Amino acid sequence: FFSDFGLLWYLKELRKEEFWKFKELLKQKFELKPIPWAELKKASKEDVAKLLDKHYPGKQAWEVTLNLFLQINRKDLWTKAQEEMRNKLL
């Protein structure tokens, strides 16, 4: 939860139907290659965090997750996460 690049801290806060929509959007500018649905179909929140690190180096994993936070109506997590990042500039 406390790893310097870890997103699981934010992913755990998704409601059950927010998490499912997050996974749905991971399947589809977002030029990169999507995660297969095979991995996503059964994937818990812990599975997704691992899958985001497998398929996207850290900088991209964050950019995709932040953007998806905005699309599933979780602005609060988008701004909490930005805040963690900006705070490390101090």
Side-chain angles (χ1 to χ4, degrees), residues 13-36:
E13 302 292 326
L14 290 187
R15 313 306 165 77
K16 289 304 148 218
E17 95 278 349
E18 300 166 350
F19 177 55
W20 298 10
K21 199 181 309 130
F22 185 102
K23 281 200 289 189
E24 265 203 343
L25 294 181
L26 271 181
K27 302 192 167 186
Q28 177 35 288
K29 174 142 241 293
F30 206 24
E31 175 269 352
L32 51 84
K33 239 200 233 177
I35 307 173

